[PDB]
Amino acid sequence: YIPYVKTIPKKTAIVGTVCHECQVMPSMNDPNYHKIVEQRRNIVKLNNKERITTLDETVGVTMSHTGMSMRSDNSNFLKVGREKAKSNIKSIRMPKKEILDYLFKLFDEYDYWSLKGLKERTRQPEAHLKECLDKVATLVKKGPYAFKYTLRPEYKKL
Amino acid sequence: KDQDDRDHFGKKRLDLAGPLLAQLFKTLFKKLTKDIFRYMQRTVEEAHD
Amino acid sequence: EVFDGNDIENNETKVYEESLDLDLERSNRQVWLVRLPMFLAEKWRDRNNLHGQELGKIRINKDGSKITLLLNENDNDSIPHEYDLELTKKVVENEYVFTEQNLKKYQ
């Protein structure tokens, strides 16, 4: 057999059995009869669909918004470039003697830390950061934790 | 019964300028929508306006 | 409402506080399957109505063979007040009506 079937239980109850099938039809001898006839005729006579709308304005006025137009778009839709370009922050070269201890505590927090995360956390330029990062740590390129700078074994094995 | 006659004009249809332009416009509009989606993907990915 | 299948661990005892077996107690209840016209169904299947008011009455001849529906005067004199119920199948087999409700998930 199969050990799992993944059923979905629910609360169900049988509350009757059908005995007669009935069709409701308006009586032919009813005073209100032949109103349904008109309604049913209208069901087909009436048409839901409409026609296309034609612009009666001047063609030049209608085309003023097309192509190379003087007016500049004011829409804010899909403004990803604006959204991510507005934010921008830079940092100074604080002396190595402080960021070095900061990096040691960060490494103690975690032992395999990426370059983008390092730039974010230390908030330093890559040019200056690389010198100290190479001086203290090394990058594992072939190991399973590839692309992640890690402290050199000389100081890590302590 | 005999095999259906292929020349029976009742089983034939005449496509006027209406249906022809309809299908041509369908194809062209599908291409236009594809281009719109491509532009959306390009702007979202490459970070353009 | 996803749940285990075979449940050989007897988890239903605590997962559900209600019997999971089909309730075969009201099955002995005569039920009529009635097909209505569009105009009548559009006002009898509405969810913003059916508060328990009297929709009309059913008149059946003593000797049978003829059944009629007499609606009340709530139709706004826009549709017939008298209809005929044509029995498309006097004897009907293998047709039942069942409900569906959720189960308590706690205890």
Instruction: Give, in spatial order, the strands making up the sheet with the most strands of chain A.
Output: 2-4-3
Main β-sheet description of chain A: 3 strands, antiparallel
Structural class of chain A: alpha+beta
Strand percentage of chain B, roughly?
Answer: under 5%
Number of helices of chain B: 1
Instruction: Give the number of helices of chain A.
Output: 7
Oligomer: part of a larger assembly
PDB class: transcription
Keywords: Pre-initiation complex, transcription
Entry title: Yeast RNA polymerase II transcription pre-initiation complex with initial transcription bubble
Chains A, C: Transcription initiation factor IIF subunit beta
Molecular structure report:
This is part of a larger assembly, with two copies of chain A and one copy of chain B (about 50 residues). Chain A is α+β, with helices and mostly antiparallel strands. Chain A contains seven helices and four strands. The longest helix of chain A has 14 residues. Chain A is elongated, with a radius of gyration of 38 Å. With about 50 residues, chain B is mainly alpha-helical. Chain B contains one helix and no strands. The longest helix of chain B is centred in the middle third of the chain and has 30 residues. Chain B is rod-shaped, with a radius of gyration of 21 Å. Chain B starts with 16 loop residues before the first helix and ends with a helix. Chains in contact: A-B, A-C. Chains A and C meet through strand 1 and helix 1 of A and strand 1, strand 2, strand 4, strand 5 and strand 6 of C. The PDB classes it as transcription. Keywords: Pre-initiation complex, transcription. Yeast RNA polymerase II transcription pre-initiation complex with initial transcription bubble. Chains A, C: Transcription initiation factor IIF subunit beta. The organism of A, C is Saccharomyces cerevisiae (strain ATCC 204508 / S288c).
